């Protein structure tokens, strides 16, 4: 029997990347096979399980989909092989061509590639288009619109990622960079949360926003335990009319509405969409069915730019995504690197975004009319990539992030001025190596 290349991804996209792997297996003509294996649903726990396999020298571990913040650590640990170790010498060129350069930077350490981007990510504003006329453009307007809805007994929750984990650090980073701040200096060696008056003011403003959302009159009473999934559910279940979340929320809403899970969008009652869910449960409609389902959603659901912190200042939205790394444990370097190239080829990218919701990194797709029609999020994604925020690249990232979320949470108890100083001190201890 053939070589088996393991391909670890978060369970959130197991269905999509199982499909991509199966396409690759057919394209590979039997020379080897790729098998998808699922990691946990939240970032911190995805890393822990990879770290366990790597530290335990799991020789069956071949390809791993890393979050865009683990590159420096995995490179320095020897866990992610440099692309230059590809026996075929093709990995570096494949990663570099027709690949968005912002995402590509997240796969680098010390000027060298240790992974090939496969998906990027940038959060959008999602809103109930039937309950307001235009969406909020700033966090002040988010709070005012939520208060209006709360006064009328409407869905008053703002759906955010507020629990003690990476998603809270992402929220903070976006608000911070949108206000003109940054966590670390460009070289990663100094803390810049409070080192100048303008940097301090950006940190305080970001903390003011998180605190205000957490203490808002109609706020989610479980906001201190919220993540991507609770935010998606809060809007689908009619408890929130305002949500910030990644682009996968659109196909999720259409799919669950067709299945009968969205009260205010009973697409299950529409006979023309029978069969839009395929044999394994994935929303995969005809072109006509997609248009009809998307158009119906527009009555009650829209997306817009992530809200900024001040008027006429577009948000700087934190980049997310996945970069494919070959694990140093692999017994089959040549096939692992070849698997990476197949998994991220242009037609697999097309499917990854249209079916999975995850933004492609292949630059060409954002100009492709067929892609634009079936992945309507593309234009706001592109707009937000032009001024994206990026979490710092540092080999102490996980340690720094754990301290930050432990300082930010519970978000109900943030004090903007004092938490700003505690955050700066906790980050300093992280880059100092205290751990
Ligand atoms: O597409 C949704 C993804 O949500 C998570 O990943 C995003 O959010 C993380 C923080 O919670 C970021 O660190 C990451 O960069 C983002 O891509 C989830 O972990 C992914 O599995 C989902 O695809």
Numbering used by the authors: 14 to 448
Any passages from the paper?
The Mycobacterium tuberculosis (Mtb) LpqY-SugABC ATP-binding cassette transporter is a recycling system that imports trehalose released during remodeling of the Mtb cell-envelope. Recent studies in mutant strains of Mtb have demonstrated that the LpqY-SugABC (Rv1235-Rv1238) ATP-binding cassette (ABC) transporter recognizes trehalose and enables the recovery and recycling of this liberated cell wall disaccharide that would otherwise be lost. The optimal conditions for the production of Mtb LpqY and mycobacterial LpqY homologs were explored extensively in Escherichia coli. This yielded LpqY from Mycobacterium thermoresistible (Mtr), which has high sequence identity (72%) to Mtb LpqY at the amino acid level. The overall architecture of Mtr LpqY is typical of substrate-binding domains of ABC transporters, consisting of two globular α/β domains joined by a hinge region, which in this instance is formed from three flexible loops.
